[PDB]
Each structure stands twice: as structure tokens, then as C-alpha cells.
Amino acid sequence: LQFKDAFWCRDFTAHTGYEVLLQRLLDGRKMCKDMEELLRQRAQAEERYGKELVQIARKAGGQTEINSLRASFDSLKQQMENVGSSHIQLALTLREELRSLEEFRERQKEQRKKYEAVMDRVQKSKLSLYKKAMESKKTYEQKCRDADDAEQAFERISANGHQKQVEKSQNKARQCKDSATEAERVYRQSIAQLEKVRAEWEQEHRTTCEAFQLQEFDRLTILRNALWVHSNQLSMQCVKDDELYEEVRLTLEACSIDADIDSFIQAKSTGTEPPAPVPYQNYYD
Amino acid sequence: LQFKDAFWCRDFTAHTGYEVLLQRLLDGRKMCKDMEELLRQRAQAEERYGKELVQIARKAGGQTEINSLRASFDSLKQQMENVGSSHIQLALTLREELRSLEEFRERQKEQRKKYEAVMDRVQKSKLSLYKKAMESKKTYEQKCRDADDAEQAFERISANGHQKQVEKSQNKARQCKDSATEAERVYRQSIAQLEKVRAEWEQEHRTTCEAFQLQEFDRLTILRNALWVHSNQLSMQCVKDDELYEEVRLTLEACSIDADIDSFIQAKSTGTEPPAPVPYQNYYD
């Protein structure tokens, strides 16, 4: 199905098809803004979260610990900062995707406005010339009835009437037929002018429908792609973080409880022999 | 080598080995607090981050969109709330791990204080009896020098001195030797009392060292496992989030651009034929 084949109106004076299509583009524009707002707020959350993780890592303690357990705790603080910075970078990625959608939306608005100007102009002219044609049609039909009455009035009083009275109706019927001829010419001219604009309107409408369908195809394409890219970027963030936390686990594999205890003893041992007992010392021996 | 075999002092009055071991337990207690503070702050970040994701999802728009693209956007909002709620649950998980370490830390302090009480009592008694023994040694040696002087005074005048003077110095020298003998028995007893406490101190020291080593083994074990659990819980969060974002991609695979355009046309189509042209209508037909 195409837009150009499904949004016509049997009513000559109705442009509901164009109104419905234009309303769809406005609804699509709102959808693009909502997708933009979600990216903006998500980016703000990621930056706030990422900065907080970095602050926790930089301010965390562990300075009284030594050896392999210290190296494992230091690894966690280091990888926390790496995750936090990676989320700050993710916020920049989301804001670039947001900027791309923002550019696409205004580009579509610019082109949409041009078609709106053409359609508004030709639709107003079409309804104006239709109004004039129906006014000319009414006048033409009244002038015909006026001419028929004048002719019937002439034939009536021309059977036993005075030449002066007949001459009055003779001229009145002639003037009425002249007015009917002129009203027909104006009516025919009104029909010709309306037909010229109707042909232009039909082509512009069909042209606009093809353009509006291309905009909708492009918008649905870029919005579906944006959701796919967004979901992948979030999934890629989970993979990056998992790899960074794995670095902590790898350090933990090198953490041996016995080695740390042996390391403390070797570094801080004060002596291996208890003090000798205090004996009695004879002052003369 | 063990704590009980490596933290002795050859100096009888020094307990640096016990002081060094006690300092290590205090440093280890600070390390447990630092691990507690990191978990506490990480939980706060996860709760704040999780709550923000839920609010973004609940307030996000998309109400003007229809059909499969709407279902994809609604899927993203739904999975955002599921991720946000999952992070709030993660914060509760972290606070339970934090509570477990807090309980372990205070249990160790309670037991540590008990060993400190035993060591403080026997070390002070050991230093007290040593001080008294050295005082008895000083008194005993002074009484001996007094006896030597009294004996030297007797030997001086016993060659050409008056019998009365010689007898007088003989009695003074004998009385001084008696005082030195009495002071010797006091000195010998001081040594015996100190030796009983020295043996008691040595056994208590060895007992405390074995206990302090068991505490260090327990602390290093629970802190190593806490880091392992923490890293695993964060990695499990990456997998949970990745599974939730995968649900969005599954919805996107069912998103067809042609189907959405066809669905809009079928629902909003206004007509398939353009309006007929307005002809000139002869009043006499």
C-alpha cells in the first residue's frame, strides 16, 4: 500500500487525507523527541553513576593492609575507576547518538514545511475557486429562469396586446437572454479556472504523499536503528565491565592466605628465642 | 615459622613481639572497615543509579507511536525498569555482605580484648616482680659491701689494736655478715617468685600468639572471599543486564518498517480514488 493511493477524499472540498498524513508526521516527530529525551536522561544517569564510582575508588582506604590482599583490594579500586570512567565515556556516546537524531529531526522538519506551504496554497485556491464556481452556477441558473420567464411573458402579451406593450416585452426578453448568455460565459470560465487548479492540486497531493511516505520510511528506519544501537551499546557496556571485574578475580587467584602470613612474619619478626630466666647471682662468685 | 616462634624478645623487660602482633590486628581491623566502607558506598551508588533508571523508564514517552516500533520502545522502557530494579536489589545484596563483615569484625574485637586482658595482667606482674627482684639484688649487694668494709675495718686493727677494740670490730663485722645473709635470702626468694611468673608469661604469650595467628587466618580468609563474592556479584549484574537488553533486541527483530507503514495505511486510509472533476452543467439538460 502507498500513501498516494489511500489518502484521497471523494468529497471535493475535503482534504482529510492530507490532514491525517500531516498529523502522522507530527506524531512521528514527537516520537523522535521522546527517544531523544530518553537518551539525554540515560546519559545523565550514566555520568552521575560513573563519576560516583570514580569518587568511591579514589577515596577508598586499604592503606593498612599489605601483600597479596592489599594487591587484590587495590585491584578492585583500580577497576572501579575503570568502570566509572567507561560509563562516563558511555554518556558521551549516548549524547552523540542524541545529536544525530536531533539533526535528523530538524532536517525532516525543514523539508516537511516546504510541502506544507505548497499544499496550503493550492488547497486554499482550490476551495476558493470552487466557491466562486458554485456562485457562478447559481447566478447562471437564475438568469436562465429569468430569461425563460421574460420569453413566456413576451409570448403571452404578444397575442392580443398593444404594440407598445409588446415592444417593452420584446426588449426585456432580449436583454434577459443577453444576461443569461453572459452568466453562462462567466460560469464556464469559473469551471475552467477551477479545473486548472484541481489538476495542480491532484498532482501536488500525489507528490506530497510520496514525499511524506519517504519521510516516514526514513524516520522508522533511523528510530529502529537507534534502538538497536542503543541496546548494543548497553550490552557492550556489560561486557566491558565484566572484563574489568575479571581483572580483580585474576588478582585474587594470586592471593594466598599462607603466603601473606609468612610474608608478615618474615618482615616483622622480632626474635625466635624467649628471654633467658633471671638467676640468682652470688656477689662473691 | 609461626607467630609463637617468631615474636619473642631477648630483652627480659621488652614485649615488642606482642606489641607488633597487636598492631597487626589493629591494622587488619582498619582494613575490614575500609572494605565495609567500600561496600556501603557502592550500595548507595547502585541504589541511586537503580532508582534513577526506574524513574526515567516510568516517565519516558512514546505515546504517539504505534505498531511494532511502539512495541520496541515500550520494550526498552520495560527492560530499563527491570535493570533499575535489579540494581536496587543488588544494593540490598551488598548491604548484607557488609553486615556480615561488620558482625565478623566485632566478634574478633571481643575475643581480641580477652587475650589482651590476660597478657596485660601477666606482663605487668612479670615486670613488677623483676623490679622487686632487682631491688632485692641492690639491697643484697649493698649489705655485702657493708660487710666487706666492716671486715676490712676488723683486719686493720686486729694486728696492733686493743683487745677491746678488736673484739668490738669483730662483733660489728659478724653482725654485718648476718645482715647480708638475711638480704641474700630475700634476694633468692625474689628470684624464685619471678621465675614462677616468667614461666607463666611464656606459656600465655605462646597461647596468645597461636590465637592471634588464627584470627589473622580468619580475617584474611573472609576478606579474600568477600572480594571474590563482590567481584562475582558485579559480574552477575553484567550478565543480568545483558539478558534484559537482549529482550529489546528480540522485539526489534520482529520490527518491520513495511509492516508498520502498511498497518498505519490500513487503519487511517481515507479513500483510494481522487475526487471527480467539477463539470459545467447546462441548465437545459
Q: Select from B26, B27, B63, B65 the residue whose CB has the most chain A CBs within 10 Å, as the one to mutate to test that interface.
A: B65
State the angle between helix axes of A163-253 and B67-157 in degrees (0 to 180), rounded to the nearest 10: 30
> Across chain A, how many H-helices and E-strands are there?
4, 0
C-alpha to C-alpha distance for B119 and B208, rounded to whole angstroms: 8
The one-letter amino acid at A149: D
C-alpha to C-alpha distance for B30 and B85, rounded to whole angstroms: 33
In Å, how far is A166's CA from the nearest CA of chain B? 26
Cβ <8 Å between A56 and B65: no
In eight-state DSSP terms, residue A9 is -
Indicate the helix (H) or strand (E) that contains A14: none
Please return the burial class of A49, using the count of CB atoms within 10 Å of its CB with bins 0-12, 13-18 and 19+: buried
Solved by what technique? Answer: X-ray
CB atoms within 10 A of CB B152: 11
In eight-state DSSP terms, residue A271 is B
SS (H, E, C) chain B: CCHHHHECCCCCCCCHHHHHHHHHHHHHHHHHHHHHHHHHHHHHHHHHHHHHHHHHHHHCCCCCCCHHHHHHHHHHHHHHHHHHHHHHHHHHHHHHHHHHHHHHHHHHHHHHHHHHHHHHHHHHHHHHHHHHHHHHHHHHHHHHHHHHHHHHHHHHHCCCCCHHHHHHHHHHHHHHHHHHHHHHHHHHHHHHHHHHHHHHHHHHHHHHHHHHHHHHHHHHHHHHHHHHHHHHHHHHHHHHHHHHHHHHHHHHHCCCHHHHHHHHHHHHCCECCCCCCCCCCCCCC
Buried/exposed A230-248: b ≥16 CB within 10 Å, e otherwise: bbeebbebbebbbebbeeb
Please say whether the dihedral angle defined by the alpha carbons of residues A202, A207, A212 and A214, taken in this order, is positive or negative: positive
Window B:22-61, CB contacts with A under 8 Å: 24, 27-28, 30-31, 33-35, 37-38, 41-42, 45, 48-49, 52-53, 56, 60-61
Query: For chain B, what are the domain ranges?
Result: 3-268
CATH class of A3-268: mainly alpha
First to last CA, chain B: 126
The one-letter amino acid at B216: E
C-alpha to C-alpha distance for A253 and A255, rounded to whole angstroms: 5
User: Taking CB atoms and an 8 Å cutoff, what residues of chain B touch A60?
Assistant: 34, 37-38, 41
B271: left (phi over 0), alpha (psi -120 to 50) or beta: left
Buried/exposed B174-210: b ≥16 CB within 10 Å, e otherwise: eebbebbeebbebbeebbeebbebbeebbebbbebbe
The one-letter amino acid at A110: E
Distances in Å between the alpha carbon of B273 and those of A116, A199, A206, B6, B277? 22, 14, 11, 102, 12
C-alpha to C-alpha distance for B198 and A256, rounded to whole angstroms: 36
Q: How many C-alpha atoms does B226 have within 13 Å on its Cβ side?
A: 28
Indicate the helix (H) or strand (E) that contains A98: helix A67-157
In Å, how far is B159's CA from the nearest CA of chain A? 25
User: Taking CB atoms and an 8 Å cutoff, what residues of chain B touch A52?
Assistant: 45, 48-49
C-alpha to C-alpha distance for A90 and A248, rounded to whole angstroms: 22
